[PDB]
């Protein structure tokens, strides 16, 4: 099968099937599958994109500049999240199918699929933190006195190959820039992780890394301005300040109508809180919060006296809707 797939990939690169004018880009996809069937005839899991991609490099460029066709017993994307959701949909369909005809192990498997969905949801929150350890001589220097302090080699620099110094410096600068660029409750946790990474970033800022060594080299002729690294430090300070800004959160609380009112007052205080740069993102968060609060109304919702209590709950819900109106007024 591997060899056939390779032959098919070769044919796709060399000889894309000449295409009947069917419009119907889904139709074109199926046509692609037909071309693959032709590849099978010629021989007698691989993937594509939409003027089109063939695959089992430039993918980022393609994302920068749409329907993906995965086979093998088929697929159609129309990027994990989609895959996870599709898997979940398939599982849901299987669960619906079970009603007729199927045991406790199968229920265990169904529970496991929901667990997998839950795990996939956690995955959407994404943090990686990078600890930068450049050089063996740098490590020896770290074991020795601080680089602000003389290195205490009687000659502290070797002229022949700083090229490595530059290479280690440029890469670090690039990685830090990318980290800077990259920078719900999950979102807050992720922002916290970002803060911790910045703190790692602040540890990176420090000398032992021999960022001071780098500064001393910057005293050294090559790439001295180092403004983009230095401007990058300023930007990292700004990011830490934003994490300080992101870090503040009014509590949203698991389950008291008075308590709900207190929560609303706290939310109003949060709406009041000092400005930090909000893109629509703050509005989207505001919207998600309102939806969650309705969810809280649902949690609260979760006999004539009972009917009266329900009516009282409805009056509260009206007040909550009014408070949401407050949210809209603040949003203005």
* Closest CB 113 distance from its own copies, rounded Å: 7
Which of 4, 52, 92, 135 binds its own copies (CB under 8 A)? It is 92
Which span (86-94, 164-172, 203-211, 225-233) binds its own copies, by CB under 8 A?
86-94
Helices (H), 76-103: 80-98
By beta-carbon proximity to its own copies, the closer residue of 295 and 321 is 295
**Contact pattern for its own copies over residues 162 through 191, marking x by CB under 8 A:** ----------------x-------------
Which of 70, 252, 297, 324 binds its own copies (CB under 8 A)? It is 70
Contact in structure between 214 and 167 (CB atoms under 8 Å): no
Which of 8, 12, 39, 68 binds its own copies (CB under 8 A)? It is 68
Which span (90-98, 201-209, 240-248, 317-325) binds its own copies, by CB under 8 A?
90-98
User: Residue 71, class by beta-carbon neighbours within 10 Å (0-12 exposed, 13-18 middle, 19+ buried)?
Assistant: middle
End-to-end CA distance of the chain: 61
User: How many CB atoms lie under 10 A from the CB of residue 263?
Assistant: 19
Under the binding rule (CB under 8 A), the answer on residue 26 touching its own copies is yes
Under the binding rule (CB under 8 A), the answer on residue 77 touching its own copies is yes
Which of 19, 122, 156, 328 binds its own copies (CB under 8 A)? It is 122
Under the binding rule (CB under 8 A), the answer on residue 133 touching its own copies is no
Under the binding rule (CB under 8 A), the answer on residue 291 touching its own copies is no
* Closest CB 255 distance from its own copies, rounded Å: 25
Which of 89, 148, 174, 312 binds its own copies (CB under 8 A)? It is 89
- With CA atoms as reference, report the closest residue to 249 among 237, 260, 263: 263
Count of chain residues binding its own copies (CB under 8 A): 64
Contact in structure between 320 and 260 (CB atoms under 8 Å): yes
User: Residue 87, class by beta-carbon neighbours within 10 Å (0-12 exposed, 13-18 middle, 19+ buried)?
Assistant: middle
Query: Kindly report the CA angle at 109 between 104 and 111, in degrees rounded to 5?
Result: 95
By beta-carbon proximity to its own copies, the closer residue of 15 and 278 is 15
Strand ranges (DSSP E) for 17-160?
Answer: 47-49, 53-55
* Closest CB 7 distance from its own copies, rounded Å: 18
Which of 5, 52, 120, 266 binds its own copies (CB under 8 A)? It is 120
Which of 15, 19, 24, 234 binds its own copies (CB under 8 A)? It is 24
Which of 62, 67, 247, 300 binds its own copies (CB under 8 A)? It is 67
Q: Give the list of residues 6+ apart from residue 247 with CB closer than 8 angstroms, or none.
A: 191, 192, 195
Contact in structure between 54 and 29 (CB atoms under 8 Å): no
Residue 9 CB-half CA count within 13 A: 13
Which span (23-31, 211-219, 240-248, 256-264) binds its own copies, by CB under 8 A?
23-31
What is the DSSP track for 58-73? -HHHHHH---B--B--
- With CA atoms as reference, report the closest residue to 47 among 80, 12, 1: 12
Q: For residue 26, give both structure tokens.
A: 């889904």
Under the binding rule (CB under 8 A), the answer on residue 29 touching its own copies is yes
Q: Which residues bind its own copies (CB under 8 A)?
A: 24, 26-27, 29-31, 33-34, 36-37, 45, 47, 55, 59-60, 67-70, 72-80, 82-83, 85-87, 89-94, 96-97, 100-103, 105-106, 108-110, 112-113, 115-116, 119-120, 122-123, 126-130, 178
């Amino acid at each position: 099968l591997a060899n056939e797939l390779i032959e098919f990939v070769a044919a796709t690169v060399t000889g894309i099937k000449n295409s009947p004018k069917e419009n119907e880009q889904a139709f074109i996809d199926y046509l692609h599958c037909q071309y693959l069937e032709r590849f099978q005839f010629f021989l007698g899991l691989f993937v594509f994109l939409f003027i089109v991609t063939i695959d089992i490099a430039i993918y980022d460029a393609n994302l920068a500049n749409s329907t993906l066709l995965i086979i093998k017993q088929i697929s159609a994307i129309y990027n994990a999240g989609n895959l996870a959701s599709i898997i979940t949909h398939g599982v849901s369909s299987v669960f619906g199918q079970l009603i007729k005809s199927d045991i406790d192990k199968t229920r265990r498997k169904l529970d496991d699929i929901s667990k997998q969905f839950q795990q996939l949801h956690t995955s959407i929150e994404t943090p990686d933190l990078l600890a930068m350890v450049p050089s063996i001589i740098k490590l020896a220097v770290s074991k020795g006195a601080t680089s602000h302090d003389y290195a205490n080699y009687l000659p502290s620099n070797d002229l022949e190959s700083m090229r490595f110094l530059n290479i280690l410096q440029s890469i670090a600068n690039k990685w830090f820039l990318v980290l800077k660029q990259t920078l719900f409750l999950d979102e807050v946790e992720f922002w916290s992780n970002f803060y911790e990474v910045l703190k790692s970033l602040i540890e990176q800022t420090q000398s032992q890394e021999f960022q001071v060594c780098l500064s001393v080299l910057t005293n050294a002729k090559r790439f001295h301005n180092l403004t983009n690294l230095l401007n990058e430090g300023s930007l990292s300070d700004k990011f830490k300040l934003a994490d300080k800004y992101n870090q503040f959160l009014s509590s949203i609380p698991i389950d008291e109508d008075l308590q709900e009112l207190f929560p609303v007052l706290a939310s109003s205080l949060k709406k009041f809180r000092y400005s930090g740069y909000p893109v629509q993102r703050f509005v989207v968060l505001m919207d998600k919060i309102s939806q969650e609060v309705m969810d809280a109304i649902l949690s609260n919702l979760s006999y004539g006296s009972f009917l009266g209590l329900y009516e009282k709950s409805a009056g509260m819900i009206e007040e909550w809707d009014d408070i949401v109106q407050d949210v809209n007024l603040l949003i203005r």
